[PDB]
Design a protein around this ligand. Structure first.
Ligand code: CLA
Ligand code: CLA
Ligand code: CLA
Ligand code: CLA
Ligand code: CLA
Ligand SMILES: CC1=C(/C=C/C(C)=C/C=C/C(C)=C/C=C/C=C(C)/C=C/C=C(C)/C=C/C2=C(C)CCCC2(C)C)C(C)(C)CCC1
Ligand SMILES: CCCCCCCCCCCCO[C@@H]1O[C@H](CO)[C@@H](O[C@H]2O[C@H](CO)[C@@H](O)[C@H](O)[C@H]2O)[C@H](O)[C@H]1O
Ligand SMILES: CCCCCCCS[C@@H]1O[C@H](CO)[C@@H](O)[C@H](O)[C@H]1O
Lengths: 121, 57
């Protein structure tokens, strides 16, 4: 149970909460009840960028990149509806949250790739 | 005096200054190597070793 002063400056604020190795159970879904996601968090650990080949007929690969905008990359405090559909499937509809981050990663050789990392709507 | 094409003969009986001149030549050569590598790095395109390798550039 950490406070802001435990956390500030550590880099922990850009990390999503974790669950133990013990959490492998099952969360029962009652078709009659209404559900929501109260908190969705997404913590990016790797940014890959598809190379742009010259002959345009070669298979393009996704290559690793170096993050240059520091621990400012995670999506969090996202909430939304969790619908129970006819076929028993669930559908999350995002309604609000910090659901975007500008991110700049750098390719080998120095080319910088800014992106709006996001799950908006 | 010494003709222009003999100015360096003053080194023949001066081991110390000969070593200095050689040090200066070596400095110049090493400096050339450094400079050349920097220029090549500033102009080299690494994106295609297949159809645009170093020897094409
Ligand atoms: C490895 C290079 C090198 C070394 C170690 C020496 C060493 C020596 N020179 Mg020699 N010399 C050199 C090259 C060299 N020289 C060249 C290329 C020339 C023709 C210009 C000469 C013409 C020369 C004369 C007339 C004399 C010497 C003399 C001497 C002795 C005294 C120092 C001196 O006055 O030099 C002076 C030399 C220079 C100032 C070289 C000029 C530099 C050139 C023009 C390039 C310019 C440098 C710049 C950073 C590059 C420009 C790039 C461009 C794109 C603009 C000493 C043993 C003297 C001596 O003892 O005689 C008894 C003397 O009278 N040298
Ligand atoms: C290891 C290489 C080497 C060394 C240390 C020497 C050293 C010497 N040479 Mg010898 N020589 C060499 C190779 C060498 N030479 C080669 C390859 C040739 C054929 C080109 C000669 C032909 C030659 C002649 C005909 C004479 C000498 C003479 C001399 C003596 C006086 C040099 C002087 O004051 O020049 C002063 C030079 C200048 C002030 C300017 C010269 C500018 C040149 C022509 C153009 C610019 C060169 C450029 C900067 C160099 C780039 C680097 C190179 C690797 C391409 C000195 C002992 C003289 C001698 O014996 O006196 C008693 C003499 O008369 N040399
Ligand atoms: C004692 C053992 C010894 C060693 C290890 C050397 C080594 C060398 N001598 Mg030789 N030399 C010696 C004895 C020795 N010498 C003796 C007894 C004489 C009669 C006095 C000479 C007369 C002589 C002449 C006239 C010349 C040499 C030159 C050279 C150098 C040519 C290669 C070069 O410049 O690489 C490039 C250099 C490097 C890659 C880095 C070297 C790092 C240095 C050595 C560290 C500094 C240590 C120390 C404080 C400096 C002086 C040490 C001294 C033993 C050389 C090389 C460093 C030539 C030279 O100096 O040209 C530039 C040269 O013109 N020597
Ligand atoms: C094995 C490699 C090697 C050898 C043996 C030499 C030998 C020599 N270099 Mg060095 N040099 C080298 C590699 C080498 N170099 C490299 C890789 C570089 C980096 C580019 C240099 C950069 C360099 C500089 C800046 C200078 C030398 C000079 C010298 C000469 C000093 C002794 C002298 O007084 O000659 C007297 C001169 C001669 C015997 C005439 C040499 C004529 C050459 C072989 C051809 C010149 C072509 C043409 C006439 C002029 C060039 C075109 C012009 C438009 C630029 C000697 C001939 C110095 C020099 O020439 O002093 C005057 C000098 O300033 N060198
Ligand atoms: C201090 C140590 C050191 C090291 C580890 C390096 C390393 C390097 N140098 Mg640099 N360099 C140095 C000092 C050094 N250098 C010094 C002091 C100078 C000024 C002279 C230079 C000037 C220089 C130039 C101009 C260049 C390099 C280049 C390079 C790269 C290519 C090496 C190569 O292909 O050479 C090949 C070496 C040989 C073929 C050696 C030939 C030896 C002859 C045959 C010996 C003959 C005499 C001997 C006594 C015979 C008897 C031997 C006995 C055992 C029988 C490599 C990264 C190259 C590069 O990539 O630049 C970016 C390049 O162009 N260097
Ligand atoms: C001081 C010091 C320093 C620095 C140094 C430096 C920075 C150097 C530089 C150097 C350099 C930067 C050098 C360069 C050089 C160059 C050269 C030496 C060149 C030459 C050339 C030639 C010789 C050519 C010729 C020709 C022509 C022109 C045309 C064609 C033909 C031929 C090729 C012949 C340091 C900090 C480290 C530390 C210690 C102190
Ligand atoms: C002790 C002395 C040290 C001196 C340092 C000198 C080092 C010089 C060589 C190092 C390599 C420099 O490499 C340098 O890279 C970039 C990208 O390729 C190039 O930069 C060029 O491309 C980039 C990206 O497309 C553009 O944003 C830039 O406007 C353009 O000028 C330079 O033209 C090149 O020179
Ligand atoms: C003495 C060397 C000091 C200069 C080093 C410059 C950085 S290194 C430089 O970086 C660029 C951008 O990433 C690349 O495009 C280029 O290939 C690379 O050589």
């Amino acid at each position: 149970t950490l406070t802001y002063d435990d956390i500030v400056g550590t880099g922990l604020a850009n990390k999503c909460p974790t669950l133990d190795d013990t959490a492998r159970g099952a969360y029962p879904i009652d078709s009659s009840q209404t559900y929501r996601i109260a908190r969705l968090c997404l913590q990016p650990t790797t940014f890959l960028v598809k190379e742009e080949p010259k002959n345009k007929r070669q298979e393009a690969e996704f290559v690793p990149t170096k993050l240059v905008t520091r621990e400012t990359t995670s999506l969090d405090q996202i909430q939304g509806e969790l619908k129970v559909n006819s076929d028993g499937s669930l559908t999350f509809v995002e309604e609000d949250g910090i659901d975007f981050q500008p991110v700049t990663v750098q390719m080998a050789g120095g080319e910088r790739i800014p992106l709006l990392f996001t799950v908006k709507n | 005096g010494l003709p222009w094409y003999r100015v360096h003969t003053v080194l023949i009986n001066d081991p110390g200054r000969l070593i200095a001149a050689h040090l200066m030549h070596t400095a110049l050569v090493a400096g050339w190597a450094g400079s050349m590598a920097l220029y090549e790095l500033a102009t080299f395109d690494p994106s295609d070793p297949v159809l645009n390798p170093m020897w094409r550039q």
